[PDB]
């Protein structure tokens, strides 16, 4: 049910969004960004270095992650 | 766009499946499994080791991948 998209990085970070089933959208905190412990609890499994950095307003069931692009 | 499911695994293999936009699902061959060269050409980006192991006719937009449990 949980789907991870392809990654897409820029000259600094590496992004990737996760698509949570809308049935679970209510379990996603609305006023604060999640911490690894939190998003890991919704069932999101991924590299520890992924950081929830922003809320996708239009579609809050779509979590927005990103991680530091090595070397610079 | 292309989406990758979560992973599960039996005793020997670690399974996962890719969901392709109906647009590219047109290009998914119906007569044979795809080689790494083939799926990568579609856009499916994954580490080597993951192999298109089974054809799923009822849903041409869902590619079933597999990998041997890491050594």
Curated annotation (Swiss-Prot), chain B:
A biological process from GO: cell division
Q: Give each disulfide bond as a residue pair.
A: none
Keywords on this record?
Acetylation, Cell cycle, Cell division
| GO cellular component terms attached to this protein's record | cyclin-dependent protein kinase holoenzyme complex; nucleoplasm; SCF ubiquitin ligase complex
GO terms of molecular function = cyclin-dependent protein serine/threonine kinase activator activity; histone binding; protein kinase binding; ubiquitin binding
Fill in the subunit field for this protein: Forms a homohexamer that can probably bind six kinase subunits.
Instruction: Indicate the family of this protein.
Output: Belongs to the CKS family.
The record's function comment reads: Binds to the catalytic subunit of the cyclin dependent kinases and is essential for their biological function.
Report the protein name in the record. Cyclin-dependent kinases regulatory subunit 1
**Species name:** Homo sapiens
Instruction: Supply the gene name.
Output: CKS1B
């Amino acid at each position: 049910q949980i789907y991870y998209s392809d990654k897409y990085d820029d000259e600094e970070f590496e992004y990737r969004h996760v698509m949570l089933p809308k049935d679970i959208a209510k379990l996603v905190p609305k006023t604060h960004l999640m911490s690894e412990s939190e998003w890991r609890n919704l069932g999101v499994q991924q590299s520890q270095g992924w950081v929830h950095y922003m809320i996708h307003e239009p579609e809050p069931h779509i979590l927005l992650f990103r991680r530091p692009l090595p070397k610079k």
